[PDB]
Design a protein around this ligand. Structure first.
Ligand SMILES: Nc1ncnc2c1ncn2[C@@H]1O[C@H](COP(=O)(O)O)[C@@H](O)[C@H]1O
Ligand code: NA
Length: 353
């Protein structure tokens, strides 16, 4: 999967810079850069620009490839689309001065990414429904859009699924400063953060996004007692059952928690800076989206961790379409005894409502 990893990495890299660069402007013009979707969730110029860069890179390199992307261009006005295009081109002017990759194409004759109709066409390639067989890309162009809009953590996530199993993942964390989580930062991290990646069977690695050439292997840690561990949880109260997560902590004597938006959580897990990622469901009717977890799935696995749902303690199934059929998500450092204690506690807490 050599070409695929290169494409994915460069695609995320470029989109990581664009999204980092525009975060403030988006926030400041949060009347004209942001749209509300049918569930009231937000989507910005940044989300679409990221999606455009990424899909255009995939399609330039792999013309027939299928993509499951959360966004679609229907309804986007020309003015809105012109703003997406302008951000891509401004980003290119900065990006090409320092980060061009030799012998790598983001655009070609078939997909030149020059017009508003090109933009629309590329966005609209994200409409695959996934499923059990064959190869397809899974993208969350801005992962944790509320984190983005709060000026806090967000990520840019891409994965390749083949026959329902995630084979490759790439997560850009443009605002992730390791010194905030008790770790050292690497040279070059300050321009646009870090990129994390893994291929099934080949290990998990990271690099500053500005580098993306020299890769450092990462692995979860293994603390022996739960009273020393650290949880990872989201910030948004509506995205997970915080009170039930607290019950879990209290039962396990955990007194250290980190809250942040996006799959950057899986990256901190995989680096060994925390131990248990909790994502219990508030409502059992919710079906988790694959693009919120697929990149992280393979990164955690290759880092030596475990990833299941939050009730049954079964592995997540990335072949069910756009959603996970199970309820909630729990990831940890493992071993299995730690993981199972956590998930069984979650199960019991939920059942006791
Ligand atoms: N009710 C919900 N339960 C779980 N996840 C949700 C819910 N509503 C939205 N989300 C997802 O939360 C993701 C961001 O996760 P996070 O930053 O970890 O809180 C988004 O990309 C949404 O798809
Ligand atoms: Na998103």
């Amino acid at each position: 999967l050599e070409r695929e990893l290169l494409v994915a990495t460069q695609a995320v890299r470029k989109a990581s810079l664009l999204t980092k660069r525009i975060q403030s402007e988006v926030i400041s013009h949060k009347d004209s850069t942001t749209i509300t979707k049918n569930d009231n969730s937000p989507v910005t110029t940044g989300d679409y620009a990221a999606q455009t860069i990424i899909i255009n890179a995939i399609k330039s390199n792999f013309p027939d490839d299928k993509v499951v992307g959360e966004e679609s261009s229907s309804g986007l006005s020309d003015a809105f689309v012109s703003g997406i295009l302008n951000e891509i081109k401004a980003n290119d002017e900065v990006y090409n001065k320092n980060y061009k990759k030799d012998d790598f194409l983001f655009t070609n004759d078939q997909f030149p990414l020059k017009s508003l109709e090109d933009v629309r066409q590329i966005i609209d390639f994200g409409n695959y429904e996934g499923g059990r067989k064959g190869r397809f890309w899974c993208l969350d162009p801005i992962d944790g859009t509320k984190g983005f809009l709060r000026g806090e953590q967000f990520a840019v996530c891409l994965a390749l699924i083949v026959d329902g199993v995630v084979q490759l993942g790439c997560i850009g964390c443009p605002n992730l400063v390791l010194s905030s989580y008790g770790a050292q930062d690497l040279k070059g991290h300050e321009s646009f953060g870090y990129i994390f990646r893994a291929v099934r069977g080949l290990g998990a690695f990271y690099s500053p996004s500005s580098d993306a050439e020299s890769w450092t292997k990462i692995h979860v840690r293994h603390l022996k007692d739960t009273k020393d561990m650290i949880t990872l949880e989201g910030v948004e109260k509506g995205h997970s059952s915080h009170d039930e997560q607290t019950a879990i902590k209290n039962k396990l004597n955990i007194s250290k928690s980190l809250h942040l938006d996006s799959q950057a959580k899986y990256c901190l897990l995989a680096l060994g800076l925390a131990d248990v990622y909790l994502r219990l469901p508030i409502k059992l009717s919710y079906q988790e989206k694959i693009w919120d977890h697929a990149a992280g799935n393979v990164i955690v696995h290759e880092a030596g961790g475990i990833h299941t749902d939050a009730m049954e303690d079964v592995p997540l199934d990335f072949g069910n379409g756009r959603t996970l059929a199970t309820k909630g998500v729990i990831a940890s450092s493992g071993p299995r005894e730690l993981h199972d204690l956590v998930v069984s506690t979650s199960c019991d807490v939920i059942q006791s409502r």
